[PDB]
Subunit: 120 residues, 4 copies
């Protein structure tokens, strides 16, 4: 797959893929912004047989509660791994907070992250 | 957490949460629409300590390649589990295909899924 | 086109289409939630020749500053008008606030609105 | 406001703002990709009183039917205008096609566009 190890997005966040096999992967995520500190568990999936000439579809989930802090939010990234230098993971993400039924309408943020091997 | 077992969204898709503990959960996803057949691996996260009076933020990833088929796409759902009948998981999802660099602009679909215990 | 007049979404918000012709339409939007009060200008577009058997693609923009208040946010809805009772406009929307460069990552909310002729 | 004139996004698309006043603006949009050719009408809104130190929230709609072609789709951009060189409009967009009720789930694409004064 080629995603093993450390990645950095344009915010200085740190994604560490510690294991990847059979279309699934695991690791840690450390966000440089927002209500977060130290590392959070990360689990995701990837296309283990990408079509020739295309990127490798990926996706992963991060619940932003560790033993130090809980923002009560879950983020998910969806995009594709693009090989050949510059290698990059281009994503769009959803950040959803647990809310009351009256506040569901404002429960989800949307953004996009670009991950690279070298910290920007 | 309360998400164990079978869920159905408004499309007739089937989400089976087979294990859930310590802020992470696993299972299968079977999509009633699109380029899919049989079951696909599912992995995700959830807020294991939701604030009082709010929903439980969730999120999960499904790579749509099993041993029968590969759509070369990865989907991620992000939202919250709402307890108290009617119990429901309200989500918004991203479906991203592996593409060529010329086609990245049209690589991601966006939608929203509402999951319930009873099939609609 | 068939969108002239008053619409209500699932939040009790009020959309009034005052004119619609030649693929463009105008009106007012009154949001029942968030930092808003009274009416805001609304401008949008629609497919003036929808394919047979399909819905009519629509889209409109609302800057949430009137002469009474300014939330410093702009919302856009994108979806389709579906004819035949029950007539409905199904949408997904983006709400973007003006921010500092350090806060761009959390500048946009995402949701979905379903509009109907009768207030829910 | 400062958005008058020609803009280019990272795809080579051309956005021409022909008039802008009182929180609303108009113009043309020419997309370098997808089912499009020549120019399409564009209408949108902007925050006419942005908070000090922040960007100017914007948003606009483009129905992709001109007198030459109809893709049966409507796109909307939502984001903010950032002043001070490099001036830029950062956006996230929704592209929604008119569909049958069975195909609504796959009716909307999601992406992000960055517009600049100089064509990339
Ligand atoms: O504030 C929170 O609720 C927890 C931190 C959220 C950080 C978000 S998650 C998506 C985006 N990309 C990042 O690397 N960080 C932000
Ligand atoms: O067509 C594909 O690429 C694979 C099937 C995708 C099914 C999507 S995933 C999100 C949405 N919700 C569902 O239950 N099914 C569709
Ligand atoms: O709080 C603000 O920034 C202004 C009010 C925003 C209301 C949003 S716009 C999209 C969603 N749908 C509605 O009818 N209201 C909310
Ligand atoms: O293919 C279509 O349905 C019409 C052309 C769509 C072009 C899209 S709209 C959003 C994105 N940004 C662009 O400048 N072009 C694409």
């Amino acid at each position: 797959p080629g995603i093993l190890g450390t990645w950095y997005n344009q915010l200085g966040s740190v994604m560490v893929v510690t294991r990847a096999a059979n279309g699934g992967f695991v690791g840690t995520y450390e966000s440089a912004v927002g209500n977060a500190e130290k590392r959070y568990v990360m689990t995701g999936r990837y296309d283990s047989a990408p079509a020739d000439g295309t990127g490798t579809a990926v996706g992963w989930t991060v619940a932003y509660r560790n033993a130090h802090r809980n923002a009560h939010s879950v983020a998910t990234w969806s995009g594709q791994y693009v090989g050949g230098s510059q290698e990059r993971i281009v994503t769009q993400w959803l950040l959803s907070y647990g809310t009351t039924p009256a506040d569901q309408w404002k429960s989800t943020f949307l953004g996009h992250d670009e991950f690279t091997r070298v910290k920007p």
